[PDB]
Every structure is written in structure tokens, then in C-alpha cells.
């Protein structure tokens, strides 16, 4: 039957996911709880600890310090920006691994990513979150929810909606194999604005959706309507990307000291 093909698709996606995303949910949960037995992320809970562990790495990542003169809120907000930039590239790599994606019209590929990357970023952000904080720098750091919320307006609440989403989403207990297919389904959304050829996209998504359904039935036998609940989360993620686009407008009304990374400028352009 075609069920075997659906399991092969699910496995292929999982393997690609492992290859594309350095910090898996499995590894994240281990850190957030206990088993790291090697990690021990630096905890940032206030201004003092922030200074102390401004990632601490002398600074090996690209773009040295000197990001200074800019207040804490702006620096943290820009840090999230560069994280997204990295994430967009990991996600693009992943999307190109989905059977049929690279054969789609190139402009539609751009459109699918443009409208899909943030939805995926917030989905995976949940993997690194618990009710008290979020892992940063591949688990080398942990910033508390309370700290992020203490940031001056309008920065003190850009993370709050994500944490709220995460708590409910994580309650569903999806694992990396589930997430790989879930993410693929989000990317292949035929209702993105401006798509040229909707049919080929829907064909691919219908198959991914069947694969997701079977994956949930086998991997979460006793989870009633997990599939139905998951589809709903799809629409919720939509709301977060729009809710965030707003706060991003209120921000450019006061700080002409922000400046958005070119890749994010392109993605946000005429998004919503």
C-alpha cells in the first residue's frame, strides 16, 4: 500500500530535519530538564547577569562587539534578529529537501518561504521554551521569561505571546519526528498571497498531511484529536506573525536606531 510510502516520506523528512537543525527538541528538552551532564547553559535573569554572560564567548560568531551604545532592549532584539537570519537559512535548506519543492516555480518557492519562515521559527522556538524561559545560542544560554518581559516598552512584550503559544503547544508533546512533518505541511501552504501555481503546492501538501496524520496515529495512539488540534495551531501561528508585525510597527515609530537585517527587511516587506 501507500501507507508504507507515507512512513518512508516521514523518515526522509526526519533525517533532513536532523541534518538541517543543529538543536533538536530532544536535545533541548534534555537541557531544559536534566541529562545535559555536560551543558549547563548560562542563565540570564537580570541586567547584571546579562552583562556577565553576554554570551561570554570572547566573540567567535561573525560580527564582533561594538554593537554598543545601544541599550539592552535593542541589543537583545537584534540578537533575536540574527537568530532568525540563521534560522531562515536552516529552514530553506530543509524546504529544499521536501520532495517536489525545488521543482516548483522559483517565485512560488520564494513566496512559500517568505510567508512560512516565521511560522516555523516560532514553532521551533517553542521547542527551546518552558514556562520560565528560553534557550539561546544552541543551549549555551537560558534567558528567563520574567527578564524579557521587564524590558522597556515596546520591547517588554514581544516574547510574551510566543511563550503563551509555546506552553499550550508543548502540552501536545510532539517529538522531532512529528515536528519534521508539521513544519513541511506549513511550508507547502497553497493559500499564501501571490502564489502563481496553487495546484502543485496543494498536491504536495495533501501528501504531507496524510503522512502527518499517519505519523500522529502511530506515534500518539492515545491522543484523541491531535491532528485536528495541530491544524488549529497552524492558524494560531498565523496570528502570531501578524501580532508581531504590529509590535514591529510600533517599534519603528520611536527608534530610528533599530535598523532591520536585510533578509528580514525582504521577508517583512509587503508581508501583512
Amino acid at each position: 500500500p501507500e501507507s508504507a510510502d507515507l512512513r518512508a516520506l516521514a523518515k526522509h523528512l526526519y533525517d533532513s530535519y536532523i541534518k538541517s537543525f543543529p538543536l533538536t527538541k530532544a536535545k533541548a528538552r534534555a537541557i531544559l530538564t536534566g541529562k545535559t551532564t555536560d551543558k549547563s547553559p548560562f542563565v540570564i535573569y537580570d541586567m547584571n547577569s546579562l552583562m556577565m554572560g553576554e554570551d561570554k564567548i570572547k566573540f567567535k560568531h561573525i560580527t564582533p562587539l561594538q554593537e554598543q551604545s545601544k541599550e539592552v532592549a535593542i541589543r537583545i532584539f537584534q540578537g533575536c534578529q540574527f537568530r532568525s537570519v540563521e534560522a531562515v537559512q536552516e529552514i530553506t535548506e530543509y524546504a529544499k529537501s521536501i520532495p517536489g519543492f525545488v521543482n516548483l516555480d522559483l517565485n512560488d518557492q520564494v513566496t512559500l518561504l517568505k510567508y512560512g519562515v516565521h511560522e516555523i521559527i516560532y514553532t521551533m522556538l517553542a521547542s527551546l521554551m518552558n514556562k520560565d524561559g528560553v534557550l539561546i545560542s544552541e543551549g549555551q544560554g537560558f534567558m528567563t521569561r520574567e527578564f524579557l518581559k521587564s524590558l522597556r516598552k515596546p520591547f517588554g512584550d514581544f516574547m510574551e505571546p510566543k511563550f503563551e503559544f509555546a506552553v499550550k503547544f508543548n502540552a501536545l508533546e510532539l517529538d522531532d519526528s512529528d515536528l519534521a512533518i508539521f513544519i513541511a505541511v506549513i511550508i507547502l501552504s497553497g493559500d499564501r498571497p501571490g502564489l502563481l501555481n496553487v495546484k502543485p503546492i496543494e498536491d504536495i501538501q495533501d501528501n504531507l498531511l496524510q503522512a502527518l496524520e499517519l505519523q500522529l496515529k502511530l506515534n500518539h495512539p492515545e491522543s484523541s484529536q491531535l491532528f485536528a488540534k495541530l491544524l488549529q495551531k497552524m492558524t494560531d501561528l498565523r496570528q502570531i506573525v501578524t501580532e508581531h508585525v504590529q509590535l514591529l510597527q510600533v517599534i519603528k515609530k520611536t527608534e530610528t536606531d533599530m535598523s532591520l537585517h536585510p533578509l528580514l527587511q525582504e521577508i517583512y516587506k509587503d508581508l501583512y
Binding site: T92, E93, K96, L106, V110, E266, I267
Partner: peptide, 12 residues
Amino acid sequence: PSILKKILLEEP
């Protein structure tokens, strides 16, 4: 000008 297009076109 499209960075996404460029990233999509590079050899995996």
C-alpha cells in the same frame, strides 16, 4: 535583490 531567491538557488 531577492536574497531568498539566491539562497534557494545555491547547491544544497
